[PDB]
Enzyme design. Structure first.
Site, mmCIF file in Angstrom:
data_model
loop_
_atom_site.group_PDB
_atom_site.id
_atom_site.type_symbol
_atom_site.label_atom_id
_atom_site.label_comp_id
_atom_site.label_asym_id
_atom_site.label_seq_id
_atom_site.Cartn_x
_atom_site.Cartn_y
_atom_site.Cartn_z
ATOM 1 N N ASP A 35 0.789 -1.223 0.000
ATOM 2 C CA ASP A 35 0.000 0.000 0.000
ATOM 3 C C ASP A 35 0.830 1.287 0.000
ATOM 4 O OD1 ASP A 35 -1.960 1.939 0.427
ATOM 5 O OD2 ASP A 35 -2.414 1.282 2.465
ATOM 6 N N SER A 199 -1.234 16.044 -11.853
ATOM 7 C CA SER A 199 -1.551 15.622 -13.227
ATOM 8 C C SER A 199 -1.859 16.859 -14.073
ATOM 9 C CB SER A 199 -2.717 14.626 -13.228
ATOM 10 O OG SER A 199 -3.177 14.361 -14.541
HETATM 11 N N1 LIG Z 1 -6.302 1.699 1.612
HETATM 12 C C1 LIG Z 1 -5.855 0.684 2.548
HETATM 13 C C2 LIG Z 1 -6.855 -0.474 2.612
HETATM 14 C C3 LIG Z 1 -6.592 -1.648 1.928
HETATM 15 C C4 LIG Z 1 -7.504 -2.695 1.977
HETATM 16 C C5 LIG Z 1 -8.682 -2.569 2.700
HETATM 17 C C6 LIG Z 1 -9.662 -3.749 2.783
HETATM 18 F F1 LIG Z 1 -10.571 -3.708 1.757
HETATM 19 F F2 LIG Z 1 -8.947 -4.918 2.722
HETATM 20 F F3 LIG Z 1 -10.342 -3.700 3.971
HETATM 21 C C7 LIG Z 1 -8.931 -1.396 3.395
HETATM 22 C C8 LIG Z 1 -8.022 -0.350 3.348
#
Ligand SMILES: NCc1ccc(C(F)(F)F)cc1
Length: 330
Positions: A35, A199
């Site tokens: 992430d 952008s």
């Molecule tokens: N942006 C971070 C994030 C990644 C995945 C999820 C989930 F869907 F797995 F809960 C929530 C938040």
């Protein structure tokens, strides 16, 4: 040193991507969501509340000979979608596709929100935004990328996400065979702790390019593309029968429609997102109404270039003294 790992979509819609990560000695492999919108390395563990674990692989620090409890350290994170997790902290050896970091903070989850419990294919998150966002208290911790930086041949990582197919995260090098043409680099602002860039505009289908500044973040952890209301309205106006639905929570379109492509500007270069990438399938099983991949950012407060946009390009996250983002067509 370098690292190279394959990333795989969790489902047929590319809702998220998982990449295998080795933690501890002997190695315990967990599938993490890389992430670039967050900075915490957190995992499901032997300490997580039993009722909040549903099929995930857990990290067991008692079975790792290199695991050390970071005395008194706690962590707590709230995500943009209302999801959350918290717990205690260990330090351990962490490897990604052959690249090893010793003494990496591994955040062990004691409690997780229902959305993480429901996603059995995601064992945790590996945060790749700037270390200023890390939630470890009282002593803030560094990200995996920040710890690997001095060992890397080059202070970069690249994201090459596949459309309904596997892709690659590379650390320490730029694979010149992975893209076409040239890489266009653009300035990054680290003030909010994100890979934030500007952008230069957009085009809908074969329409005229509109030069306009769109400040947003390159976020591998967000599925969709969130853009200002004016831009999103101009895109969906080209799809017959499309409309914003308050019950669904966004723009929906007739599943039989053909979606126009979406172009975003990177300096003087253009990245074209094919229309098929913007289709997120039926809102519910059997429905003839489909969910759009381009939604308004008005309720969020920030524009997000999520997996929908990033998967259409080869993306370089240059973590040099002055950070930059590179984009190339592929
Ligand atoms: N942006 C971070 C994030 C990644 C995945 C999820 C989930 F869907 F797995 F809960 C929530 C938040």
């Amino acid at each position: 040193s370098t690292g190279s790992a394959t990333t795989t979509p969790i489902d047929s819609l590319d809702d998220a991507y998982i990449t295998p990560v080795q933690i501890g000695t002997p190695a315990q492999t967990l599938n993490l969501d890389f992430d670039t919108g967050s900075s915490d390395l957190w995992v499901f563990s032997s300490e997580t509340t039993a009722s909040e674990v549903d099929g995930q692989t857990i990290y067991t620090p008692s079975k790792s000979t290199t695991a050390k409890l970071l005395s008194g350290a706690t962590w707590s994170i709230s995500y943009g979608d209302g999801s959350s997790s918290s717990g205690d902290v260990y330090t351990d050896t962490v490897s990604v596709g052959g690249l090893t970091v010793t003494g990496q903070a591994v955040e062990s989850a004691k409690k997780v929100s229902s959305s993480f419990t429901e996603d059995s294919t995601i064992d945790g998150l590996l945060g790749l935004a700037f270390s200023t966002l890390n939630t470890v208290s009282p002593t803030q911790q560094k990200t995996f990328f920040d710890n690997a930086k001095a060992s890397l041949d080059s202070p970069v990582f690249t994201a090459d996400l596949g459309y309904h197919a596997p892709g690659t995260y590379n650390f320490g090098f730029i694979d010149t065979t992975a893209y076409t043409g040239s890489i266009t680099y653009t300035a990054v602002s680290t003030k909010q702790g994100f890979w934030e860039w500007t952008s230069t505009g957009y085009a809908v289908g074969s329409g005229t390019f509109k030069s306009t500044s769109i400040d947003g973040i390159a976020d591998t952890g967000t599925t969709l593309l969130y853009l200002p209301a004016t831009v999103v309205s101009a895109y969906w106006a080209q799809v017959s029968g499309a409309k914003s639905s308050s019950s669904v929570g966004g723009y929906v379109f007739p599943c039989s429609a053909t979606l126009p492509s979406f172009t975003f500007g990177v300096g003087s270069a253009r990245i074209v997102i094919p229309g098929d990438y913007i289709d997120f399938g039926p809102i519910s099983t059997g429905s003839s109404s489909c969910f759009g991949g381009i939604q308004s950012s008005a309720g969020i407060g920030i524009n997000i270039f999520g997996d929908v946009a990033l998967k259409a390009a080869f993306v370089v996250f240059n973590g040099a003294t002055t950070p930059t983002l590179g984009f190339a067509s592929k």
